[PDB]
Structure 1
């Protein structure tokens, strides 16, 4: 039906069935997450296998079958055979290293468990960064990605709990997202705070003048290198685009796009131009000596815009010689049979 309510209920229901106790459960899972790492590493150590591979095989066995490996990540790990081979060596690890295997999985599990339980935390946080230009669901989701980030770095040895830790790692994720996706035309984080400061300033300036500040105040109040050109520029990028498709004129049935003209396209007038221009330029180009005419015809009209570098072996003296003597004989007979005079431009 309507999307927000369903997800809210979705994770709120599961947290409702499994919130993490303040100390115990967060500590428990945390402890397991870390041992997973310590395990995977020692696993890489005795298998010679990359910690990245040991991490993806334990993930597959705990989070999903061949199905989840085949669709998400295209196909380099053989759906069945590949991952299984890896699992076999893990079994061969006697009593000592087998332990790490059993640990890695359970840790991976806790990771997931710790992640589930702390989903209300995200939503509660994400709840406040709402009207920034992102969908609540989008916001919660980015924030969610933030919590997963926190899970990777929390050190349970350092007594502080996951609550305060997740807050930061999430708030970071969200704000970034807000700055990265909110607009149609991307604007880096610095420009963003820049714009917030600009805005906040204009607010304090609105406070007493009764005059929506000329871009003079804004420069002053802002700080060190702020000038009119800078503020007019910033607020110009601050305005989001307009809907090329918006209700126009009297709102009846007016779509903002039949009125803008087109530039690349040669309006008939121009197609006729290029025809005579090229046919006449082509006639002249032929009645001349190739040596320096083509040089300047091709150097100017074929690639890019170098007198010396223009002619092949023959130096500058013959260039200027024929260039200026052929160009003038060409212009003065063209003066006789006036074809080009009526400036095609």
Structure 2
């Protein structure tokens, strides 16, 4: 038994009849007029066309099956917007919609980071131009060389070629052998080591010790501002909500608490020692 998704689908499309021009006009007249059967038979008859055009747009992003579905969707738009009265054949018209829809879908799904169509198409013209340049310049083209050919800013080219960088799989093994990959080396810079986490504990606890070594009205406005002891991290003007109810006297008392604490760090042995980190 053939269980291949592809082979099964291609079997089913084969068993629908190819249409002639007069048949296409007859069906399509009723199809625009809303005939469930007409649209279906035109679709089912012309699926084979979709697949033939789907075998040229491979090795680019998605697989044949994927392309075959987007192609089908293009053919559906073509059946909806076909003009039977116009002498022009259907296959000619459908080809445009199928190629269009396939190209456009391979431009949004082909890249892990969704690049907008417009950036992608801009970049594409830069690429095709680079190919012509390389065909007569023997050597591949520089950023300025591409920019010189299009009469455009070098920064435009640089930024457009800076969005072409591809994604590397985290799980892809290094050295060929399936052992340690980029995940086994890639260090989390968001998660710090116990050395750094413990330094923060020591730092935060240090201040507290010398925070209760100052004045009673110097550590009741300095901490209630930073949100160290208090509940909410206020600003100079917001400390008035507590009891201070001042704007200049709060700013004088904040900095007076800081200045006596600067001398507490200079005597214990920090100041410039704890400045580097």
- Regarding TM over 0.5, the answer is yes
Deviates more, 1:204-213 or 1:107-116: 204-213
Deviation at 1:310, TM superposition (A): 5.4
Q: Is the 1:27–1:161 contact (alpha carbons within 8 Å) kept by the matching residues of 2?
A: no
- Gap runs ≥5 in structure 2: none
**Larger RCO, structures 1/2 (Cα 8 Å, 6+ apart):** 1
Q: What is the rounded CA distance, in whole Å, between the counterparts of 1:195 and 1:305 in structure 2?
A: 49
Q: Deviations over 1:97-125 (max 9, x none)?
A: xxxxxxxxxx1122222211110121122
User: Is 1:27 paired with 2:46?
Assistant: no
**Greater helix share, structure number:** 1
Q: What is the rounded CA distance, in whole Å, between the counterparts of 1:19 and 1:304 in structure 2?
A: 75
Q: How does 1:1-345 map to 2 (within 5 A)?
A: 1-11=3-13, 13-15=14-16, 18-24=17-23, 26-36=24-34, 107-224=35-152, 226-227=153-154, 229-249=155-175, 251-257=176-182, 258-287=184-213, 289=217, 290-298=219-227, 307-309=236-238, 311-312=240-241, 314-338=245-269, 342-343=273-274, 345=277
CA distance 1:286–1:171, shift in 2 (3 Å): farther
RMSD (Å) for aligned C-alpha atoms: 2.8
- Gap runs ≥5 in structure 1: 37-106
Q: Is the 2:143–2:158 contact (alpha carbons within 8 Å) kept by the matching residues of 1?
A: yes
Deviation at 1:302, TM superposition (A): 8.1
Give the count of matched residue pairs: 267
Structure 2 residue matching 1:265: 3-state secondary structure: coil
Q: Deviations over 1:49-91 (max 9, x none)?
A: xxxxxxxxxxxxxxxxxxxxxxxxxxxxxxxxxxxxxxxxxxx
TM-score of the two chains, using structure 2 as the length reference: 0.83
Q: What is the rounded CA distance, in whole Å, between the counterparts of 1:160 and 1:211 in structure 2?
A: 46
Q: What is the rounded CA distance, in whole Å, between the counterparts of 2:191 and 2:262 in structure 1?
A: 31
Q: What is the rounded CA distance, in whole Å, between the counterparts of 1:303 and 1:337 in structure 2?
A: 30
Q: Is the 2:107–2:120 contact (alpha carbons within 8 Å) kept by the matching residues of 1?
A: yes
Q: Deviations over 1:227-261 (max 9, x none)?
A: 1x333333332232122232422x22344221222
CA distance 1:209–1:165, shift in 2 (3 Å): closer
Deviation at 1:275, TM superposition (A): 1.6
CA distance 1:297–1:22, shift in 2 (3 Å): same
CA distance 1:188–1:157, shift in 2 (3 Å): same
Q: What is the rounded CA distance, in whole Å, between the counterparts of 1:209 and 1:272 in structure 2?
A: 59
Q: What is the rounded CA distance, in whole Å, between the counterparts of 1:165 and 1:323 in structure 2?
A: 76
TM-score of the two chains, using structure 1 as the length reference: 0.68
